[model samples]
Target: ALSPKAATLAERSAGLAFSLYQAMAKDQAVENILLSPVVVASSLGLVSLGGKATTASQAKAVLSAEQLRDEEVHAGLGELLRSLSNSTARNVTWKLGSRLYGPSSVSFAEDFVRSSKQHYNCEHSKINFRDKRSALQSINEWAAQTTDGKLPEVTKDVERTDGALLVNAMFFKPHWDEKFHHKMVDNRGFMVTRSYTVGVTMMHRTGLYNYYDDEKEKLQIVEMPLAHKLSSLIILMPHHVEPLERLEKLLTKEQLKIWMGKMQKKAVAISLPKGVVEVTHDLQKHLAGLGLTEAIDKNKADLSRMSGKKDLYLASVFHATAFEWDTEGNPFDQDIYGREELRSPKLFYADHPFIFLVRDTQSGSLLFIGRLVRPKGDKMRDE
Candidate 1:
């Protein structure tokens, strides 16, 4: 539940994990190697995406971001990107970030330094500066002292092909509309929506699951909260959560419809928060390792799709993010530009056991799912 920007980064990361999955899913390596990226980096992040664009861009950035460079390895990175695009379960969201410099851009870096870091991606520069907000007189002084009024991105500059340094960055943020309440939590049936059954400690709250029941699909959504609502976990329960293996193989909107119907608005009990877990992924390590290995190799990485790049390589893949989580029904942040007269949506509560999912609105993909059970004992089991 980092930030939505993590979702963008996750797509690129998933492409590689997906590649490894297909390369050995039916081979002997399947037994020795982990079944999925999640198998090994379960604590990091859950990434998976569609399209060759995400993969190639990610591989190129990851490969070049570091000091190492392997043309052959770099060449292969794009291919892996392509292969990953072809083998996705669905659109997904996930992210892993680090405080390379300080706690956060807003809290740590000085306004000038932060602004520099935002624009430059220097190869040989030390980014250790004081943190401070920007003001007026300082702006004039900066203009008179800096390079023709053009400041640096990093703390310093590194020798470049063009003889200048630069800094690259990505940012994102999102929040759940409805917040979940723990007071109504209960232990009932919960379909993990996974391949197997595992007893999960569910967090339950009664309210409304922003409902959408159509002939095409049905799904139950329940929200979950993180420390001080900084992040959240959403679970989606299909009508046939019992046979998730089947759903895994055959995914569709209609399947969701059947599951949506199982929900009864009639004083229903809900269960949520399946297990104690944290997903973490150092994309820098993951992508860099691969870019330095499989991409750059003209014999493998497919950069032809990019049109140009006789001298191109993925440099680095660093991402940062943050957000809020809602299990029941929490209000979402609103951005209204024109009117002071605009009224926000009426406050609503998600009471009773329901279905929920952590979804990517842009990609329309399901990241995770869970079932809310009220009594706190009607455990979910595999048939």
Candidate 2:
């Protein structure tokens, strides 16, 4: 079992993760979105080590761990980074990595840099920023390697004035334990709105599942077990065309815990539309709006603890993510291998706009979040 301190850190991380999701959800122009807040928080935690006064406080505030001491925050994050990257199952791949890029002239604190390498598995690297494209290539290469090419390019262009860039990458690929039958796949229409509809190939599966229906919140929660014994996928399907803002307001940690605790095992025939969602966003404004104004502001930014040089500030917080819901598994897969259990039968047809998340039960960290709108095929666009 994890110590009480580690559990507390996980809870705080979860809060920041959801809060950032809500902040990004405010964008109505984009319907399909994907993010990993744990990755972002881990990267920011490293930055807080170098923050002098206001910058450090802002990072701590954004992480939702203000009461905890600085050393405790770093230690908790170190443990969290290890816990998040460890996957016991051979079929599952869950990874989280962090990197820091600075110019050759600037020098980071020896103590902070060494502790980062020792505890957080992060290293502060000096790159030649004179050649902007070359520096950008190095950063992208690290991200691509860490995420297994899930996110090939994080930033399209890096400006000359950007002195430093902190990037965090998270990649997860897992198959359902109860594999879907290929013959059952069929084309279905997904309702984007009352009048708009998009054709999508839906995968059909029937199995015993842990399910819950929140009548008060007007949503359905279905837990789809993954190949690994430790994790499961959760879907939130609203009863109506509920905007993400509405869902955000209704879904708090307390309400989510209550709904999960009340879930009952039952036979379920689930029809989930196979889709792909790829999204990239710059989080400068989002962080600023979340009361982290000093972070993005050049005049007020306090990164004195990070570098010996003067006049350094955050230029951008870029995030890139992608996910595909297809029947991909081990090539030498076989039939389902598990004991039979009896439960009441239910039908769960996800044919409309819905929110989905990959959750790690052990640490209570939200690994990934996606909003599927206007569902499309699961083809990855080749670069």
Candidate 3:
């Protein structure tokens, strides 16, 4: 269970996550949206630690951290990170890393560095921004290594005038508690739209799952637990054949909490795409849109807490995520043990666009949020 402070912080961070998702989804061209909510929130929190006056207030407001003091927020995030790193699950692979890159000529304040290191486990590295090639190569290399080569390049360009860059990378690959049998995997048509379909590899399984059918909202919610029970993949799928925008608009922290509360354990037959979803985002524009304008503005920013330099301001904020799930689990695990009481299993088929999220069970923090509009595979024309 999470402490009260961490729980509050988690709620606020989730708000930021949904807001950013809505902002990114505004572009109809972006068919697939993936984000590491905790990573982005933590990166923003780290920046807020070094901000003063309008700079700090703006970040706090966007993060929904206006009610908590800076110290409380930091401590809550620190505790959450510690819990995530302490997981000993063999069936799950999770890695999270952050770094601060700044020009060699600038001197970071000692107090700010210490606080970041202590709270976020972030390390500051000096790079010569004059050599943009070297700077980009170094930052991209770090991102690649941290995500286990899942993301080889996060940024392709660097500016000589960049005062600082904050990069956060996360990779998560967890097997389902009950793995789908190899024989059950088959190619299926996934509807990307009313007129388009794509062939994808789908994994099938039957087991007892936490499920809820929101009759009023016309959506089905299912919680699939990952191995070790430390986290879960919660998917929300609209019942009618409609664009996801209809459901996205109604999403809120309160609604999510209510949906989760109403979920009941029941027999379910699940079919989900077996593939990878990866995304990289430059969050400056989105953050600025959410009232974090001062920090990114050169003249209006006041980040003196980071350094004594008068012109110090945020240059960029980058976030990357790679999430993959397969049909790998203990082969001996069978769904027959609990089959006696089951009549007919509820269908939780993900054959079309849906919203999914991986949430940490302990801290109630959203580790990842994604919209699977089209699965990665061979494109097929609807006949």
Candidate 4:
């Protein structure tokens, strides 16, 4: 059901998806049930994930909605995250459910391999017993344990309508092979652009770092290792601070290779800050803004999911998301420094919304995606 233009956007994004999956919208208001943020955010590292739910046929219309356009990444991401949240954790009774969510349904679904139908007619996994609460708690624990408590907020959830919700939660546990001392933190002016300079606390540390200078696209690469080497953050800072659009356009796999090939050990320190953000959006109008609409008309799209009865009429769609990330890893303590005159470290925080994606490694595909701008503490669910 994803339209031609929409499909093109998806394809382009897929080429650039780099671990990001903007989601689809559902028709009905399915109660407090919603999607998954951690899943979306996790896509940054996960390879493949599914956003289709309700027998795929019951929700297939989503793939055709005006919302799936690639330009509408923000809106699409929000839906994907929340939808994943509500859709996941449910046990399947037949192969249809297994076909839709079996291969990746948290821990329990793994046991249902016997029932999972290889082609939707056979059961691949079952137990599709829907356990939304437990699924949420499990996702939260995964976040806390992953981010080393530096990102405890990943556990919280936002309420959604009866039909569907989109959400994303991520935990990045990166330990610089060489640690930065809390005492080494200092303030610095960030040249966000030539005209604008923002001052933020910069955390700096000097040690052997993964380094490479690109000869082709000329991408400067620094692969920061997290607590686990298998997973780490790759910072591709361009030589020019042009508009984000331009920098992003310049990004290519070739440039990434140059960054990887020119590796040399050098004593380097980085200044970063901890910041978070949340963003709310309107779907249809937003998609149109990104040049997507054809699929909205049933005549132009192939959405079998929304019509369980088979006529293929549309349901409804809406989405929202909140996100945050901080560089406040180790707490500050003067006692730890012990009268040391340390050159303060610089920290980088993301208080403003920015484009991002999550991908699975095995297949080099996206799992989930979204952006963070201004998140609130009250976004948490009430006990």
Residue lDDT tens for model 4, 1-383 = 23343233333344432321222222122111112222212221111112222322212222333344323433343333333223222111000011122212223233222222221121221112256565445544433443344334333432321121222323232233345675776655544445555555555654345665555653455545433232234555545543344345544546445555676644345545433333323232323222333322334323232112222211112222222333423333546444333344222233222333433222223333432222232222235
Worst 10 residues of 3 by lDDT: 83-92
Off by over 4 Å in 2: 87-92, 123-136, 158-161, 182-186, 194-199, 328-345, 374-383
Comparing 2 and 4 by TM-score, which wins?
Answer: 2
After superposition, the stretches of candidate 4 with alpha carbons farther than 4 Å from their true spots are 1-178, 215-219, 277-383
Ranking by lDDT: 3, 2, 4, 1
Q: How far is candidate 1 from the true structure (C-alpha RMSD, Å)?
A: 16.4
Which scores higher on lDDT, 1 or 3? 3
TM-score for each model: 0.33, 0.83, 0.88, 0.44
Candidate 4: residue 333 lDDT (0-100): 50
lDDT digits (tens) for residues 37-109 of candidate 3: 6677777787789889989888777767789889888898888776666542422377778888877877889
**CA deviation > 4 Å runs, candidate 1:** 1-178, 186-199, 212-235, 240-243, 250-269, 274-276, 280-383
Q: Spell out the clash pairs found in candidate 3.
A: none
lDDT of each: 0.30, 0.71, 0.81, 0.33
Give the Cα error of residue 128 in candidate 1, in Å. 21
Collision count of model 4:
95
Report the alpha-carbon TM-score of model 1 versus the true structure. Answer: 0.33
